[PDB]
Tab-separated table of C-alpha atoms in Angstrom:
chain	number	residue	atom	x	y	z
A	97	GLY	CA	0.021	-0.058	0.040
A	98	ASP	CA	0.747	3.634	0.318
A	99	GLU	CA	1.919	3.674	4.299
A	100	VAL	CA	5.285	5.356	5.442
A	101	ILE	CA	7.440	2.802	7.197
A	102	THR	CA	11.360	2.842	7.623
A	103	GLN	CA	13.046	-0.374	6.248
A	104	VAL	CA	16.600	-1.190	7.414
A	105	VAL	CA	18.574	-3.635	5.515
A	106	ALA	CA	22.448	-4.342	4.529
A	107	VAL	CA	24.705	-4.315	1.802
A	108	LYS	CA	27.859	-5.722	3.050
A	109	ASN	CA	29.889	-5.682	-0.222
A	110	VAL	CA	30.819	-2.147	-0.377
A	111	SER	CA	29.952	1.115	1.503
A	112	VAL	CA	26.250	2.119	0.263
A	113	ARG	CA	27.137	5.917	0.091
A	114	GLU	CA	27.898	5.049	-3.617
A	115	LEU	CA	24.022	4.575	-4.019
A	116	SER	CA	23.260	8.039	-2.740
A	117	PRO	CA	22.576	9.651	-6.012
A	118	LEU	CA	20.375	7.200	-7.786
A	119	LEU	CA	18.548	6.221	-4.530
A	120	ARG	CA	17.791	9.959	-4.258
A	121	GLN	CA	16.432	9.551	-7.584
A	122	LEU	CA	13.745	7.207	-6.416
A	123	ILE	CA	13.529	9.963	-3.722
A	124	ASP	CA	12.866	12.044	-6.506
A	125	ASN	CA	11.292	9.647	-8.979
A	126	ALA	CA	8.224	9.967	-6.405
A	127	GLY	CA	7.149	11.885	-3.535
A	128	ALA	CA	9.318	12.896	-0.634
A	129	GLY	CA	9.137	12.242	3.050
A	130	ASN	CA	11.734	9.699	2.481
A	131	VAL	CA	15.175	9.239	3.931
A	132	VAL	CA	17.980	7.210	2.771
A	133	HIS	CA	20.799	7.149	5.417
A	134	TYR	CA	23.812	5.294	4.885
A	135	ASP	CA	25.608	4.332	8.133
A	136	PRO	CA	29.426	3.855	8.215
A	137	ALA	CA	28.842	0.862	10.425
A	138	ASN	CA	27.485	-0.403	7.285
A	139	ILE	CA	23.728	-1.040	7.469
A	140	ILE	CA	21.210	0.759	5.452
A	141	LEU	CA	18.118	2.950	6.467
A	142	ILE	CA	15.097	4.022	3.980
A	143	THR	CA	11.854	5.871	5.432
A	144	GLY	CA	8.923	6.359	3.451
A	145	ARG	CA	6.290	4.803	1.256
A	146	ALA	CA	6.534	1.074	1.466
A	147	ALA	CA	6.228	0.999	-2.319
A	148	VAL	CA	9.109	3.422	-2.849
A	149	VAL	CA	11.170	2.203	-0.102
A	150	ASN	CA	10.538	-1.084	-1.630
B	101	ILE	CA	10.819	16.162	29.396
B	102	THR	CA	14.658	15.248	29.082
B	103	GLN	CA	15.679	11.815	28.026
B	104	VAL	CA	19.632	10.584	28.519
B	105	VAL	CA	20.210	7.475	26.583
B	106	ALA	CA	23.558	5.957	25.170
B	107	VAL	CA	24.917	5.306	21.652
B	108	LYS	CA	28.363	3.400	22.409
B	109	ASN	CA	29.138	2.219	19.051
B	110	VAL	CA	30.233	5.673	17.301
B	111	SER	CA	30.112	9.227	18.285
B	112	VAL	CA	26.572	10.630	18.258
B	113	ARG	CA	27.492	13.864	17.033
B	114	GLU	CA	27.115	12.022	13.602
B	115	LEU	CA	23.394	12.515	14.131
B	116	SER	CA	23.247	16.312	14.766
B	117	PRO	CA	21.659	17.137	11.471
B	118	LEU	CA	18.911	14.673	11.078
B	119	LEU	CA	18.120	14.796	14.979
B	120	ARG	CA	17.910	18.688	14.566
B	121	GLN	CA	15.532	17.663	11.709
B	122	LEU	CA	13.183	16.248	14.585
B	123	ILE	CA	13.853	19.500	16.438
B	124	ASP	CA	12.778	21.059	13.112
B	125	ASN	CA	10.041	18.623	12.151
B	126	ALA	CA	8.035	20.006	14.957
B	127	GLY	CA	8.084	22.626	17.716
B	128	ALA	CA	11.327	23.712	19.368
B	129	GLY	CA	12.147	23.984	23.242
B	130	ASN	CA	14.481	20.787	22.556
B	131	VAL	CA	17.817	20.292	22.923
B	132	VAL	CA	19.891	17.421	21.707
B	133	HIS	CA	23.363	17.402	23.237
B	134	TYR	CA	26.111	14.932	22.564
B	135	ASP	CA	28.436	14.615	25.296
B	136	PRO	CA	32.139	13.641	24.351
B	137	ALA	CA	31.759	11.269	27.205
B	138	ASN	CA	29.605	9.171	24.923
B	139	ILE	CA	26.198	9.477	26.520
B	140	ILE	CA	23.041	11.330	24.813
B	141	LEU	CA	20.805	14.158	25.725
B	142	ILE	CA	17.256	15.095	24.637
B	143	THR	CA	15.023	17.628	26.157
B	144	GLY	CA	11.518	18.400	24.799
B	145	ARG	CA	8.157	17.099	24.034
B	146	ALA	CA	8.057	13.345	25.005
B	147	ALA	CA	6.858	12.303	21.682
B	148	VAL	CA	9.621	13.926	19.649
B	149	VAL	CA	12.060	13.239	22.320
B	150	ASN	CA	10.953	9.802	22.057
B	151	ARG	CA	11.198	9.649	18.013
B	152	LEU	CA	14.450	11.483	18.589
B	153	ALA	CA	15.372	8.533	21.110
B	154	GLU	CA	14.476	6.061	18.549
B	155	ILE	CA	16.710	7.459	15.758
B	156	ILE	CA	19.352	7.752	18.608
B	157	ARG	CA	18.779	4.150	19.823
B	158	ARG	CA	18.793	3.368	15.940
B	159	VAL	CA	22.386	4.237	15.996
B	160	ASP	CA	22.704	2.610	19.550
B	161	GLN	CA	21.482	-0.839	18.780
B	162	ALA	CA	22.483	-0.835	14.868
B	163	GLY	CA	26.272	-1.688	14.757
B	164	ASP	CA	26.935	-3.553	17.910
B	165	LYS	CA	30.334	-4.444	18.538
B	166	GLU	CA	32.155	-6.221	21.150
B	167	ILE	CA	34.607	-8.689	22.431
B	168	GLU	CA	34.462	-12.487	22.424
B	169	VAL	CA	36.309	-15.311	24.295
B	170	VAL	CA	36.248	-18.861	23.063
B	171	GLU	CA	38.621	-21.627	23.364
B	172	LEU	CA	40.803	-22.845	20.663
B	173	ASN	CA	41.817	-26.493	21.823
B	174	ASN	CA	43.913	-27.387	18.691
B	175	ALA	CA	44.858	-24.959	16.069
B	176	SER	CA	47.399	-22.421	17.705
B	177	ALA	CA	45.590	-19.189	18.652
B	178	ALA	CA	48.780	-17.343	17.148
B	179	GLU	CA	48.305	-19.487	14.125
B	180	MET	CA	44.442	-18.568	14.174
B	181	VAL	CA	45.761	-14.821	14.642
B	182	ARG	CA	48.067	-15.025	11.214
B	183	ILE	CA	45.490	-16.945	9.320
B	184	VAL	CA	42.871	-14.363	9.704
B	185	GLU	CA	45.558	-11.670	9.725
B	186	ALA	CA	45.566	-12.083	5.869
B	187	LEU	CA	41.821	-11.097	5.983
B	188	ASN	CA	41.024	-7.394	5.810
B	203	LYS	CA	38.889	-6.997	14.975
B	204	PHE	CA	40.829	-10.067	16.256
B	205	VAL	CA	42.543	-11.209	19.426
B	206	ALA	CA	43.578	-14.498	21.066
B	207	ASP	CA	45.539	-15.820	23.751
B	208	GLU	CA	47.848	-18.641	23.836
B	209	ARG	CA	47.880	-19.015	27.588
B	210	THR	CA	44.377	-20.160	26.939
B	211	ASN	CA	44.475	-20.631	23.074
B	212	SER	CA	41.374	-18.834	22.558
B	213	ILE	CA	39.970	-16.517	19.944
B	214	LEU	CA	38.944	-13.196	21.527
B	215	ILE	CA	36.881	-10.980	18.913
B	216	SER	CA	36.205	-7.122	18.792
B	217	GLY	CA	33.238	-6.340	16.704
B	218	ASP	CA	29.602	-7.004	15.500
B	219	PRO	CA	27.402	-9.701	16.388
B	220	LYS	CA	27.717	-10.275	12.527
B	221	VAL	CA	31.390	-10.719	13.450
B	222	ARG	CA	30.255	-12.839	16.137
B	223	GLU	CA	28.204	-14.915	13.567
B	224	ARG	CA	30.700	-15.311	10.915
B	225	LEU	CA	33.813	-15.441	13.432
B	226	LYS	CA	31.924	-18.122	15.313
B	227	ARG	CA	31.990	-19.475	12.103
B	228	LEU	CA	35.885	-19.223	12.021
B	229	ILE	CA	35.995	-20.010	15.706
B	230	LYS	CA	34.761	-23.417	14.345
B	231	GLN	CA	36.207	-23.429	10.777
B	232	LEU	CA	40.003	-23.797	11.667
B	233	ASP	CA	39.880	-25.720	14.972
B	234	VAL	CA	40.607	-28.974	13.259
B	235	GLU	CA	43.680	-31.066	14.160
B	236	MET	CA	45.830	-32.832	11.519
B	237	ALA	CA	45.989	-36.791	11.540
B	238	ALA	CA	49.421	-37.825	12.360
B	239	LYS	CA	51.492	-38.042	9.361
B	240	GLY	CA	53.906	-41.021	10.851
B	241	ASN	CA	56.667	-38.312	10.210
B	242	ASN	CA	59.158	-40.393	11.718
B	243	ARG	CA	59.224	-44.271	11.441
B	244	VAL	CA	61.379	-46.859	13.032
B	245	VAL	CA	62.620	-49.398	10.670
B	246	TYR	CA	63.693	-52.953	11.738
B	247	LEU	CA	66.630	-54.080	9.420
B	248	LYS	CA	66.409	-57.670	8.714
B	249	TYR	CA	70.105	-58.129	7.496
B	250	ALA	CA	72.167	-54.754	7.138
C	203	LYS	CA	42.043	-12.547	-2.465
C	204	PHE	CA	44.115	-15.743	-1.466
C	205	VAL	CA	44.943	-17.479	1.779
C	206	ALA	CA	45.948	-21.105	2.791
C	207	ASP	CA	47.168	-22.786	5.727
C	208	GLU	CA	49.944	-25.392	5.930
C	209	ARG	CA	49.216	-26.321	9.338
C	210	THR	CA	45.896	-27.756	7.097
C	211	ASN	CA	47.397	-27.316	3.921
C	212	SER	CA	44.116	-25.816	2.659
C	213	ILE	CA	43.296	-22.778	0.340
C	214	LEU	CA	41.405	-20.177	1.836
C	215	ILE	CA	39.637	-17.671	-0.197
C	216	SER	CA	38.404	-13.958	0.155
C	217	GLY	CA	36.111	-13.193	-2.690
C	218	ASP	CA	33.263	-13.827	-5.052
C	219	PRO	CA	31.111	-16.914	-5.788
C	220	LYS	CA	32.686	-16.437	-9.202
C	221	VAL	CA	35.792	-16.602	-7.064
C	222	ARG	CA	34.250	-19.524	-5.675
C	223	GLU	CA	33.611	-21.080	-8.992
C	224	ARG	CA	36.648	-20.400	-10.411
C	225	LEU	CA	38.911	-20.830	-7.413
C	226	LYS	CA	37.234	-24.190	-6.712
C	227	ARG	CA	38.334	-24.960	-10.185
C	228	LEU	CA	41.967	-24.038	-9.073
C	229	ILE	CA	41.513	-25.690	-5.772
C	230	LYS	CA	41.333	-28.700	-7.974
C	231	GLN	CA	43.697	-27.552	-10.607
C	232	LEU	CA	47.051	-27.932	-8.728
C	233	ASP	CA	46.199	-30.317	-6.286
C	234	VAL	CA	47.936	-32.968	-8.194
C	235	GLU	CA	51.102	-34.847	-6.958
C	236	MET	CA	53.884	-35.937	-9.309
C	237	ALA	CA	54.606	-39.450	-9.996
C	238	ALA	CA	57.843	-40.830	-8.147
C	239	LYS	CA	61.039	-40.064	-10.386
C	240	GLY	CA	63.243	-42.574	-9.011
C	241	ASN	CA	65.319	-39.526	-7.930
C	242	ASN	CA	67.779	-41.715	-6.315
C	243	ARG	CA	68.745	-45.394	-7.348
C	244	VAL	CA	70.865	-48.132	-5.677
C	245	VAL	CA	72.982	-50.180	-8.297
C	246	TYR	CA	74.454	-53.536	-7.542
C	247	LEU	CA	78.007	-53.568	-8.745
C	248	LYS	CA	78.696	-57.085	-10.560
C	249	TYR	CA	82.534	-56.632	-10.683
C	250	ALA	CA	84.084	-53.345	-9.546
């Protein structure tokens, strides 16, 4: 559905800052309210609509 | 009310912009102050102080890292050391002959995996042999 | 990248499951042991 939830998922292989521009492309591709925050401890944060967060 | 909660894993100054986002997202009166002794201060409405403490604890609980101590009965610890050293943290003691670990409960999963991986002891090779001469 | 132990005499690997495919290939490739060459020989002198 359209709900706003945060999802925490990992990419171990290389630091996920590498995805900041294209992920903010999906933060741009649709409506905002999102965050995608890349923890240097290497996990992954999204917040926003479950579809675009997907 | 003010809430004092910890993030041990890395210094919480790292959260100042996004936490002030929740100091911006709603009304002010808040403080979030990051003590270099590594604890955490919020002050403000219990709801926004909560979501703040949830981001905060979301960098607390996130990256967990500590030490393990696990017996190495067979493969020399210092060897375990060396043979992990090539991998790119780790301790062991050869008083005990035990891998110690510093890092993740993912490091705890995979490095209990490598606790187990090189524990094995090679079968005797008959390196030396006593031969009974029949004639000579 | 690559490791091994000669306690165990075992290749350890760091890298891909493509590195796992090809480097199980090279796990297997140089496992072979050369046949004995009769490097030394005891010769029975008939006369001298």
